[PDB]
Amino acid sequence: SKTTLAARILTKPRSMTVYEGESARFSCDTDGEPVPTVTWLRKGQVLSTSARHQVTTTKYKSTFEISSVQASDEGNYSVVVENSEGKQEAEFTLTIQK
Numbered sequence: 001s002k003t004t005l006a007a008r009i010l011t012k013p014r015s016m017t018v019y020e021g022e023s024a025r026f027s028c029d030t031d032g033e034p035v036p037t038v039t040w041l042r043k044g045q046v047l048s049t050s051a052r053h054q055v056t057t058t059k060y061k062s063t064f065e066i067s068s069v070q071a072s073d074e075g076n077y078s079v080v081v082e083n084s085e086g087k088q089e090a091e092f093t094l095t096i097q098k
Helices: none
Strands: 008-011 016-018 028-031 053-057 061-066 076-079 090-096
Touching: 061 076
Parallel strands: 016 090
Antiparallel strands: 008 028, 028 061, 053 061, 076 090
């Protein structure tokens, strides 16, 4: 934080519920200095495109979309967005019933 910011999720990613990897898209706008950071995780070994999920990020706003789930991604998923000194997060359940 060259100036004096940190990490604050201006907006988080809503939740959803599908039978598998239909096409649920999400996005959380997080600000911070010089740039914030987003780490999706809850119970799927770092959501970070592990293999069944596919996340991504830009600068002050990350995004997570699911369409590859197999049979162990469960629903409840979250995102601990933080930065050089901030430490915030968000939550949303993305189930994949069958």
